[PDB]
Structures are given as C-alpha cells and as structure tokens.
Symmetry: D2
Subunit: 116 residues, 4 copies
C-alpha cells in the first residue's frame, strides 16, 4: 500500500473517524483527475486507496474533507478542506503516509516517505 492517510482529532484526543478523503492526479491537460477516494476507519486510517502499479509518477492532491467531518459532529469549522499537493514517485516508487491533525480553526499535515 503505497499511499496511506491518517487523521487525528486534537479536540477529543482521538482518531478522526469517518473522514472522507478524495485523491486527484494532475492530467496531461493540467486538470485534476479523480484518482481514488475513501474514508478513515475507527483507527483514523485510510488504507487501500491505490496499488503500486496504478500509483505512477505525477502530481497528486489529497483532499481531506475536514468541513464535512466537523459538520457531521455538529461543529461549524473554518476551512473547507485540507489539501495536500505533492509530486510522487519521481525518484522511483515510494510509500507515502499523509497525516493530518485537525482542530476547528487549524490543522497541521506532515508526510512520512519511505523507500521499500
């Protein structure tokens, strides 16, 4: 599994469960093509977005639907979503974990990149 997303909730001190995530890849025409999507599990993790064969070099956007997450909890947050945009696999295949820590008016995101 070459792309994993993990989301934490800084208000509750818990995994952020049921967070929708949409991944896009920049196409040759420079538009954002839908690539994969899913939701975080009870551990805050989202596995199985893609395969090593399909996850080719390119520019990818991971959109974490933070507003939908906070609104489903009956909280009015600031951001629409958190967007994480990066070039992947340009030095050969890597494994990427995109992590995010959410509050209603703030978030932080980090990447852990490993070479299998």
């Amino acid at each position: 599994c070459p792309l994993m997303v993990k989301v934490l909730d800084a208000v509750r001190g818990s995994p952020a469960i049921n967070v929708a995530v949409h991944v896009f890849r920049k196409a040759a025409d420079d538009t954002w093509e839908p690539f994969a999507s899913g939701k975080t599990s009870e551990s805050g993790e989202l596995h199985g977005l893609t395969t090593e064969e399909e996850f080719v070099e390119g520019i990818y956007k991971v959109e974490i639907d933070t507003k939908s997450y906070w609104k489903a909890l009956g909280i009015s947050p600031f951001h629409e979503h958190a967007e994480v945009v990066f070039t992947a696999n340009d030095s050969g295949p890597r494994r990427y974990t995109i992590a995010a820590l959410l509050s209603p008016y703030s978030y932080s995101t980090t990447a852990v990149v490993t070479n299998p």
Copy 2:
C-alpha cells in the same frame, strides 16, 4: 485590511520572507478566479491584499508557494504549495489572519479571526 497572511519558517525560527502568495475567489462555475497576490515582507507578513468593499462573502483559496521558498534556500521540500481554503462569513468577526508555519515535509495553518 480584512485579510492578512503571515508565514513562518520552523527550520530557521524566522519569518518566511519573499514567499509568493496568491489568493483566489471561487466563481459561480466552481473555477478559481484570481483575486489578489503579493510576496511576504521581511516580517513574513503580506498586508494590503484587499479592501472591505471587495472582500465579499464566498469561498477563497490562499496558495502559498512553499516549494520555491525552500528551493531558494537550497532545501528539497515535499509539497508543491500550501493551500488554505475557507469561507468568508459576514456574521463572524471582520478581520482574517491566515497564518502558516512551514517545514520541508510539513506545514500547519490557523486562522485568527477578530474584530
């Protein structure tokens, strides 16, 4: 000044100077229309982006060109840019500060919204 952007560097413990910032406003057809832009000052701040008259309710995107910032320092970074997408709402307080704290493989962002 209804919108200010502040950028900080977590590697050097300093303002992030001469960072390009582009602001867009979501149009009726869901595209992003250029709205305002500039470069951060020696204090890491970008003032003067817009006016109260122009900054109507709607969805805005602030794009911070972090990749060029790190490369100018001779550092290889992870992200293409940092993006902050939010709704401006007239019910809340009137002044928006979008702050970003940058590292090569991470960033955080907060909003400080005051009267």
Copy 3:
C-alpha cells in the same frame, strides 16, 4: 523587549486571552527560579516581561497555564500546562517570540528569533 509570548486558540480561531504565563531561569543548582510573569492581553500577547539588561544567556522555561484557560471556557483539556524550555544565546538574533497554538488535546510551539 527581548522576550514576547503569543498564545492562540485553535478551537475558536482567536487570540487566547487572559492566559497566565510564568517564566523561569535555570539556576546554578539546576532549580527553576521565578523570572517574570503576566497574563496575555486581548491580542493574545504578553509584552514587557523583561529587559535586555536582565535577559542574560542561560536556560529559560516559559510555562503557559493552558489547563485553566480551557476550564474557564468550560472545556476539559489534556495537559496540565504547556512548557517551552530553551537557551538564550547572545550570538543569535536578539528578539525572541515564543508562540503557542492551543487545542484541548494538542499544542504546538515555535520560536521566531529576529534582529
């Protein structure tokens, strides 16, 4: 003003107002000696803690009383306080801003050190 402390609230998107802040300086016997204290202003800032004459090189601790802040808002928080421990060094730039961004179960802190 060689040392300033700024505190922000990530739940409400605001300065963290009336937060108690205590600064200590490490003594020769490794204990923490009271050095300066105050409460953050309506802007989330605490100015005036010390003077250039008094702020000599050494190890300092800034303790931010986050638990009382959250409880006054009716929120149950994780940490007893936030602590920032650092060395003041005359070789580096002269002005230190210690910034903290607070959530109930998390906080971040950065240093912005400038001339």
Copy 4:
C-alpha cells in the same frame, strides 16, 4: 502497553529514530520522580515504558530529548526538550499515545487517549 510515544521528523519526512525519552511522575512531596525511560525505534515509536499495574493515577511528565536528537544529527536546535505534562488514569485506566512532530525551531504534540 498503556503509554506509547511516537516521534516524527518534519525536516526529513521520516520517523525520528533514536530519540531519548524520560518519563517522570509527581511524588507526594511534589518532586518529579523518575518513572521510565527509553528511545524511539526505527519506526519512531517507543513501546514498553511501563505496565498497567505500575502506571497508576498521577501527574506524569514525558520529556522528549529533542536537543540531543538534533545535536546527534549535527543540527543546532532551539529547544532543550519537549515536555508533555498530564494527569493520567484519574477516571480509571486508559491507554495514552503521546505523539510529537519535530522541527529545529518548532514542535507540535498531541495525545490519543483510548479506553480498553
């Protein structure tokens, strides 16, 4: 394992390996008594600090030796250490993960608390 520590490096986009961690517990005389210590593994994680029986209610301080970590890499950082101070187990036993994301002039820390 009721207390785990995870540390990430925001400059390299990797686990922070070989980070020393010292845990203290406030004693009846209000001093900080040494409680447990260890170092992060190649995954950035530190397991096995304590046991459910020994990890009683109290106020605990987790000291993450960030300066020692950056200096071992030949980097001059700002902070001496990151200190995480919290009351544990006051509503019965819980499992705590203390996470930290490190940069030379900044860090963020979060807690994930679960009820077994």
